[PDB]
Amino acid sequence: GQNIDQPTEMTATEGAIVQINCTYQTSGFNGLFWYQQHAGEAPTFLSYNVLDGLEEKGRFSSFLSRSKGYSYLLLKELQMKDSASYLCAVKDSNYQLIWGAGTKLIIKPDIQNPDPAVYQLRDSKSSDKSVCLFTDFDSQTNVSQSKDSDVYITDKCVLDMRSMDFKSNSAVAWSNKSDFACANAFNNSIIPEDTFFPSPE
Amino acid sequence: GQNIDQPTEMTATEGAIVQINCTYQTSGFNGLFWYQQHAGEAPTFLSYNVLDGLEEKGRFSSFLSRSKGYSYLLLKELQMKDSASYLCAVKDSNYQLIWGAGTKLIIKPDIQNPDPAVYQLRDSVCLFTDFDSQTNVSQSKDSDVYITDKCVLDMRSMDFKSNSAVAWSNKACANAFNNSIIPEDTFFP
Amino acid sequence: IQRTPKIQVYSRHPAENGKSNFLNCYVSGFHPSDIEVDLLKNGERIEKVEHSDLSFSKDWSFYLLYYTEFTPTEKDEYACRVNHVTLSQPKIVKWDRDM
Amino acid sequence: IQRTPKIQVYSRHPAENGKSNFLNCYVSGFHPSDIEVDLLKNGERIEKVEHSDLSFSKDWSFYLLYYTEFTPTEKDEYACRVNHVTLSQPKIVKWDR
Amino acid sequence: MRTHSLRYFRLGVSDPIHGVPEFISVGYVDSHPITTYDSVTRQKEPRAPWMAENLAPDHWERYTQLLRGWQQMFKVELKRLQRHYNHSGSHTYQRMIGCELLEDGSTTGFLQYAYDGQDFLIFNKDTLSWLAVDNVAHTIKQAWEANQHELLYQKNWLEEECIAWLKRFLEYGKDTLQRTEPPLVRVNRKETFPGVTALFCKAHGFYPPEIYMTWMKNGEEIVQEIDYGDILPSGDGTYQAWASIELNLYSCHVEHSGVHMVLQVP
Amino acid sequence: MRTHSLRYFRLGVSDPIHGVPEFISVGYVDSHPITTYDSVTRQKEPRAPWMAENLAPDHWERYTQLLRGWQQMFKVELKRLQRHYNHSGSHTYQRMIGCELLEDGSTTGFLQYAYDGQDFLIFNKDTLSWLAVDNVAHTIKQAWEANQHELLYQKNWLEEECIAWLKRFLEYGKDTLQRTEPPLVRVNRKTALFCKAHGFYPPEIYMTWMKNGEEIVQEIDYGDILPSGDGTYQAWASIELDPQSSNLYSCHVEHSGVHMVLQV
Amino acid sequence: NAGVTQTPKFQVLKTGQSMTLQCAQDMNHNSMYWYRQDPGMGLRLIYYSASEGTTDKGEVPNGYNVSRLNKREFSLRLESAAPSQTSVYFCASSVWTGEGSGELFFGEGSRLTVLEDLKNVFPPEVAVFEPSEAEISHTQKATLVCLATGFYPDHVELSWWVNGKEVHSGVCTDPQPLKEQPALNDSRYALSSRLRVSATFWQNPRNHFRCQVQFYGLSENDEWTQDRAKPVTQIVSAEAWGRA
Amino acid sequence: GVTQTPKFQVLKTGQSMTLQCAQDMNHNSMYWYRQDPGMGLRLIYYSASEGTTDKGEVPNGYNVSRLNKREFSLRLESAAPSQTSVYFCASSVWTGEGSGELFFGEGSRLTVLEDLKNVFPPEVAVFEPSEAEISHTQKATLVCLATGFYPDHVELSWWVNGKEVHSGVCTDPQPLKEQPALNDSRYALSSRLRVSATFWQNPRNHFRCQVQFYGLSENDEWTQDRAKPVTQIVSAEAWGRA
Ligand SMILES: *Cc1ccc(OC)c(OC)c1
Ligand SMILES: *Cc1ccc(OC)c(OC)c1
């Protein structure tokens, strides 16, 4: 056991299929495991393959080719809750696990009715920041870091209003610079042409 | 609140490190002060602590522990000039100070060349001098025999420090300091 | 910036004509603090009128509560009359009779 | 089920009198594994006898080899004395070249 | 428990006309006044029976001496505020300090100032800085943040001293502050303007004053254009409020001291 | 090559007499011990020199940890067996695992358990199931067969992992395992005709008698193949001679691809 | 069944400090492991205990020792912390080691930061920002935002409390924190989070919103000498009320 | 900073005394403390700001007057011996602010007696260095004695060749009691000046030990044969020998 390789990141779309590959070059082979690791939490056993072929377990099936030295983990009908890291591990001839680095799996949500807008949030009596929220864009849109050092722009985040059964993307930008305005907060990003900028006061 | 407690007296060697504890039982706590009072003089502000931590003002640092209800004042590289009383005060929940009774700090000097001896002076007085600061001096066991506590002088220009006690009487010089435990080599001319 | 008083006139309990009760004038949201309040019965000022001390809101305005014991009749008109620097003349606010 | 040991005494080489040789006692097929084996010179227990480690068979019984160096003389008699849970008093096998 | 708080207010009026005092200071536990002082009487006095019964006379004597000093502090600060603004006339100066004891055991603290009833300075105890609303506030802020030890003292009062006093007043007046009187809730229906029906959900009799009322359509989504009445003091230590909608089956939902109520409209 | 095999054995005893170990485990290549471990030394150490010289100390360190674990799992299993049989006193539990690499290149593989020296459970890596001899064994079978993944693991180890270790050990010990020392065959009398071979390696030797050119089965007396003590084996095979008619008796010996005949 | 329990969840240590992570499992397992997870690498084993009564080195044992105190518990001791030991530590267990198919069961993990001195430790400022009226009018939905800024190390847990009860529906907190000054190695952090509710819910004046951040920082033992307040473990929160 | 008067004062039982304290710091709070051995400062009266005063721990026997923002008086109504103490006036910026410290005045050493007849100035005598010490150490110690005075109202200084000296000097902090058994015992103080042997052997060198004694004022009336024990300097002197 000296080498496991899997991709660093993968991005797919809600509802699609995605296939995570693991290629091991090890001395001996007593089985290949898949673990799931949601962000900030503990890994959990997903599957085990020791002989060639393909085992299904719900939306997840895992494949093994002992001769070719590779396995893949197949996720069908992707849901937002499959956004985790997927860790690959191989038992070598001496029953020692060999861990791959993991694959972080990002899921783009299927946004039904895009209404992209940049809103200005009410100031807080207890802060000197002004806070802009870019919201309701389609998953195609990327949010890029600030160019100015005194403006801070967080990356895209997906929220789910369970009751309304509704999903939106959003990013936040803030600053205490005098110049800072929402109409300019996300200039360094490629945003939709139709983006609503409500008139200020 | 009611009680603030600090040791009555503390003694340490010059160049060393002494730490002066103040433990307090009060109802409410809005700060803790350390004041310095040289004998004969008035107190002066040194240190204020209200939250946990240590604060350093040169050779002096002060430390507060809120859950343990104590502070200490810590002095590094003791000089003789740090002989003084250290008063510790706490503002209770009504903003009244509660004062500790103070800690008298005595600094023994490190004597390079001990030379214990007992000379006689004229114009009736016997001087015990040049001993090591380990020596402690007993008082007088007599009605008209007067013995003073030991005293440190510093000749600034020759850079020399010295101990000395004095005894005198109205009505006897070799037996002058028989109450005390003197060095076995104390020179009597 | 001055803020003019909000004036609310209501009974302590759901009002029944002919049943003993308490009439309330809650004056709030005003700034500055100097304010006059009286309770009227058919236009004349009532004299046995309790009231709270001046009180402070987190938004820097002030509020007060004025109350009196009364028995609501169909004939009696009640009201609350309030003066403040933001007012040209006193404002008399009538009790809506829990309608 | 208890299985009782099969004892075999033989020499390493075809013994020529006076020529040096090795006398083997080979105990096999017994179960369980506790066993006592001795080599006898004219009935006396040979002091320094070496042996192998307990060995396993595919039929779950055990085997051992006890051996000692010696020189066969015409007047001397040699035996093997085995003791086992399946045996009432120890069994004795004489070497009969 | 539920959420409790303790707050002290100060008011300073320059050039008070006729009766209005120059300085008032009032303290509250929740919505109950507990202490009062002003520049006319010059005495710190209790405003709740359970404060008078449980605090010895020397407490009132001792805080009278402080408020007399704080009266003078305020008079002068107001004078330098008007000078900074080049304001003549009568203006006001307010201070709010206090703390909250949360249901889940966490705590908050606030210390705020205001000039002519508007936000002037705001202390942040978790960063030990003053937030200023204009260039005048920025001048006062710089002096205040120069004094490192006083900023530390302010934090310690808001997180430790204040919360201890609040826990003490809670016990002193627990029969008042921790009681619960459930709401009397009724629904009224009425046709108002031709074709418009108005549904009113009225509550009264409850204490503590914090209550949640809302209207729900078909059990799931809240209806829009709800109108809410203020939570008004009834004069007897209890409170009233309401909520109304116009117009399927509707229902009023009331929540108060951990008890949910539902009133279905016929 | 000839047929070579690798097997590992475990023995557990529930109430061992004083000083006798509770757990032992030896591994063999062919007839040669290569490794040992037991509950007393608590260390896995080689039993053959060419093993010692080719496996680094980290290997012995790793398998010592494993075997300390397997010793305990073996105690637990024997406890569970003895209680289900309602058996008092001292009983034994045994396991054998291993594989054969054949001359033609095919392989075999076996794993089976024993209780009191009798078959208990035998694994069949084709049908992927366990054979049960009695009902204590049946209950264990039902629990093992549930874990389908664990059965698949045994299949892969026997068919791949074991054969790969065997090839590796065959190279380390090749000067030993693959040499040939052919045998020294003689005849004499005692009345019977004895055919005695000695000094041969490997220990696989075939010795039959032949009367006038026809093989015999019932008449022939076969001796065991025995260690000599020097790395070589000796065997014999007798026959009883007809006192009334003469016959052409000839000893046949087969060993390591060389057949030889001794006329009398 | 409690699974694999390890403690502490967060820890700040000064170079050379001692510490001990605990691990228990009530699953009656025999094998227990201590891993460390580091960015860009696969889990590395530190020590393992194949059964009660034995322990052994893993891949990276230097700077650690362990103790298989009994069958249930297996603790990992660092005796002189190093900045390189800043990592997230996981405890695991399995029924037996060497079964091949037997899977690992992990504990919740322990996040450790080792600093040269504690002058860099900062609790977070917390501020809540109320929804945009343009947004409410346009989309009939209201989005509050909570910003936690200037903290260090990244030991924070942000939550949202609506009418006194914690909520999770309609929340999005960043999965990683913004480095405020991305070049500097010791840079402080910022973390944002949104709660989106219906405009009807926002417009009830009796509704109360609170975001609260739990910071894990120093404790009584830690020697503090700076001029600012000592950055202890603490809760920093900010609130808002509905507007009609 | 903070100024109070007088530094010293003797009082016959029943007399009246007013202690003055003034501060040019624009401070609002002012305090009157007394300091007795073995216990911490005890507050007598305080003034939280101009226009108010209130009592402290030990108010009986005194009253105070906050005359203006800068001045705070302590009046002894009818002096008793138990009012013998060292008195400290202090001010702070405001009472309420928890961080602010006290600034103290120099102190008022005040001694109260039933009969002024026990008040005695000191007798001062200088003692010339031992010839043995000069040879054994090449340093010369001369010692000053002030004896039989009452009350303990002294300050000792050494003056060489007309200018005061500080190097080479030790004076005892507390004097000793000559009749330790009695309440009203008299006091003895001593001090050392050590200099080079060559300095002592130069007769162009004049050494003077000086004791300032704080006794009766011109307002006290004195009827005894012996001289009125007023505030005064008492000195003794020596010249370099060979
Ligand atoms: C009794 C009391 C304590 C503190 C304050 O102000 C912070 C007041 O103000 C009225 C009273
Ligand atoms: C060294 C070694 C490897 C594998 C096995 O069999 C599982 C054993 O058993 C004794 C020993």
Author numbering:
A (entry chain G): 1 to 201
B (entry chain D): 1 to 123, 130 to 177, 181 to 198
C (entry chain F): 1 to 99
D (entry chain B): 1 to 97
E (entry chain C): 0 to 246, 252 to 270
F (entry chain A): 0 to 189, 196 to 269
G (entry chain H): 1 to 244
H (entry chain E): 3 to 244
What sentences appear in the manuscript?
MR1 is a highly conserved antigen-presenting molecule that is ubiquitously expressed by all nucleated human cells, with cell surface expression of MR1 being strongly ligand-dependent. MR1 can capture microbially derived metabolites formed during riboflavin biosynthesis, including the most potent mucosal-associated invariant T cell (MAIT) antigen, 5-(2-oxopropylideneamino)-6-D-ribitylaminouracil (5-OP-RU). Several MR1-binding ligands are anchored within the A′ pocket of MR1 by forming a Schiff base covalent bond with the MR1-Lys43 residue, triggering MR1 egress to the cell surface. We describe a range of compounds found in CS that bind to MR1, and we detail the structural basis of their interactions, thereby revealing novel scaffolds that bind within the A′ pocket of MR1.
